[PDB]
Every structure is written in structure tokens, then in C-alpha cells.
């Protein structure tokens, strides 16, 4: 058992250039005929982290990979599973029951149409046209692929991958040193 790492953003230096979302889209859809260039993407854009801008600046929010995850436990079908250290939703068994949106307080899960092989996925018996398949999208730490593309795509490198052992140890060491430097 190991604590799940989670990427976090820095609102102090973040600009809101939206250059990390597009990299996430490009890295997730490698099987949908993408050649790292514009004009080869005939499918709409689907990101995983979402940017929110308010009077106190702009910041991207994403899945925190909750240890006591409510999204996995509310899911009755069992689409959300903890395959690795991070938490990842499975698109094969998901049916679109929006109870996940009733669970996650941060709100990093979006219900969006599926896209495979450069085409939109159709269904059997729905309405007289057919209806798109809606699936759950959230960050999966890019554990299936290599190093996550959101890192080293920010111009000032605002977002960082942190796992809470080293941060806690550094904070405790700094607090102890500050306490000892005064006494």
C-alpha cells in the first residue's frame, strides 16, 4: 500500500494559457490517427484537467485521486477501479449513470461523447436518428502511457507532480529547523 501521487497547480505563477489541456488531448488520443500536428485531428477536443478563472486568478483543477474515493464506491456498475496506484475509470463498462457527479466534490469528471478510430460511437436502440455514447472522462495520472504530458508543457512549469511523503517530511524539517534556530 502506497499513497497515490497527485499533480497540483500553482495559482501564483499560472497564466491561463491553456497549453496543458491540449497536450493532454493529444497524448490521450494516440490511437485516433494523430500525427502531432493540426489538420490530422478530425475529432473534437476532450481534455481531462479543467481550467477555472475567478477574481483570484486562474488555475486548473483536476482529479486529486482521493484515498477514500467516493466516485469508485458510488459506482454500482463497477466502471471505476483502482488498477494501479492512481484511480482510473474504465470506458468499457461505464453506462453514464451520473451518480459520480453526486459524489466528487472537486468535480473533475465530465460526461462527454466517446471517440474511437476517428469516428463517433453509435448505439443500437436509441432515438429518428441514433444517439451518441456518453462516457466519463477524468485524469488517470497517465500511468498507462509514459511520463504525463501536462508536465513540461506549461511555459513557466507551474503544475508539479507531488506525492505527500516528501512534502510532509520537508515541511516538518523546515518547521523543526525554524524552531531550533530561535531557541
Amino acid at each position: 500500500t502506497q499513497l497515490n501521487p497527485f499533480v497540483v497547480a500553482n495559482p501564483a505563477k499560472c497564466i491561463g494559457c491553456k497549453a496543458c489541456e491540449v497536450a493532454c488531448f493529444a497524448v490521450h488520443n494516440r490511437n485516433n490517427h494523430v500525427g502531432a500536428t493540426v489538420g490530422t485531428v478530425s475529432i473534437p477536443v476532450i481534455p481531462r484537467l479543467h481550467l477555472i478563472k475567478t477574481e483570484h486568478g486562474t488555475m486548473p483543477i483536476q482529479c486529486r485521486h482521493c484515498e477514500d474515493a467516493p466516485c469508485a464506491n458510488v459506482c454500482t456498475v463497477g466502471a471505476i477501479k483502482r488498477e494501479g496506484n492512481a484511480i482510473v475509470v474504465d470506458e468499457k463498462l461505464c453506462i453514464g449513470c451520473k451518480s459520480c457527479l453526486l459524489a466528487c466534490p472537486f468535480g473533475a469528471i465530465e460526461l462527454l461523447p466517446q471517440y474511437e478510430d476517428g469516428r463517433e460511437v453509435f448505439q443500437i436502440n436509441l432515438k429518428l436518428v441514433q444517439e451518441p455514447r456518453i462516457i466519463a472522462y477524468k485524469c488517470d495520472l497517465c500511468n498507462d502511457l509514459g511520463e504525463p504530458a501536462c508536465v513540461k508543457a506549461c511555459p513557466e512549469n507551474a503544475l508539479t507532480l507531488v506525492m505527500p511523503t516528501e512534502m510532509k517530511k520537508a515541511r516538518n524539517k523546515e518547521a523543526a529547523l525554524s524552531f531550533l534556530r530561535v531557541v
Binding site: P70, N73, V74, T76, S99, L102, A103
Partner: protein, 174 residues
């Protein structure tokens, strides 16, 4: 309401035992020797398909001689009065009715058994109501894939799923 039988494709090897048992039980009883449970091959999975006993049938509404009728808790063909007007074969959504013809058998182990062993009418799963034991298909299966669902098992399953959903929603987050 009506009792029927369902087979989850997770534990079906396609071993042709249920099909042969369904054929031979009906043969030794004195009815048509043809099976009433069809094995279908698809792109993803193999599942036997039989007559899910429709509570409105779409079958007795098209029979001109009034051969198909509801008896006990099942839909019964009443083979004696059937004439062969292939009308119920049009109105069955799942395709659970086949006709007693030698060419209707696909090439498999069962065909070899029935040719080394040795009227045309519509045959349908009658749920083996003439036998004091349960259905033969659910009883001879090596992996117990098939299972018989009653009027009360549906209610029990519905209540179980509903209670599990409510308890999970209560326990995790309101």
C-alpha cells in the same frame, strides 16, 4: 408472472450438452426430437438463446388456428393443432421458434450423434412442464450456466439491487 430461463455467457463453453439433452428428453417423451434452445456464435461471446416467455407473447396474436396458449406459467405450442403457417416465425423478436425439419440442424456433434443413432411443425421451449424434475437444460449443464427465474426470484433480485444501491449512497455520500 411467467417462469423462464436465462444463460449468462460468462460460463458457457458451447459444449452442446444442454441442446442434446433438450432434444433427447423431448424425443423419449413422445414429442418432436428437435432441440428448442439454439446456440449462436457472435463477434464477442457465445450464448444460448431460448424462448423468454413473453407476457403478451407476440405469438398467440398471429396464430390463425389458435394453437399457442398460456398454460400454468408458460407459453405452450399445442403441436397437435399447429398447421405450419410460418407467421409466428415473423413475429418472434429473438427468433425462438424453429420448425421440425432435418435441414434445420447445423453441422455439429449433435448432428453426428443423431445420424449415428438412426410431420413438420413449429417447436418451442415448453419449459419441460411434463417432467417432475426441473428443466433439463438447467440440470445437465457442466458449468451451470443456465438458471431458471421464477415470479419471486425477480422480486428478490430487484429488492437486493435496490437495497444495495440505497445503502451505498447512504454510506458514501448523501
Amino acid at each position: 408472472p411467467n417462469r423462464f430461463v436465462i444463460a449468462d455467457p460468462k460460463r458457457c463453453l458451447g459444449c452442446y450438452t444442454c441442446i442434446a439433452a433438450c432434444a433427447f428428453v423431448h424425443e423419449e417423451q413422445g414429442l418432436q426430437p428437435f432441440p428448442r434452445l439454439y446456440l449462436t456464435y457472435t463477434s464477442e461471446g457465445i450464448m444460448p438463446i431460448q424462448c423468454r416467455h413473453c407476457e403478451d407473447a407476440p405469438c398467440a396474436e398471429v396464430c390463425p388456428v389458435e394453437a399457442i396458449k398460456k398454460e400454468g406459467n408458460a407459453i405452450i405450442i399445442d403441436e397437435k393443432a399447429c398447421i405450419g403457417c410460418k407467421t409466428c416465425l415473423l413475429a418472434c423478436s429473438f427468433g425462438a421458434i424453429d420448425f421440425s425439419v432435418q435441414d434445420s440442424l447445423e453441422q455439429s456433434i449433435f448432428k453426428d450423434i443423431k445420424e449415428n443413432l438412426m410431420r413438420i411443425v413449429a417447436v418451442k421451449c415448453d419449459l419441460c412442464n411434463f417432467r417432475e424434475e426441473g428443466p433439463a437444460c438447467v440440470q445437465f449443464c457442466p458449468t451451470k450456466a443456465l438458471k431458471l427465474v421464477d415470479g419471486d426470484e425477480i422480486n428478490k433480485m430487484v429488492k437486493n439491487k435496490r437495497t444495495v444501491n440505497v445503502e451505498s449512497l447512504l454510506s458514501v455520500y448523501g
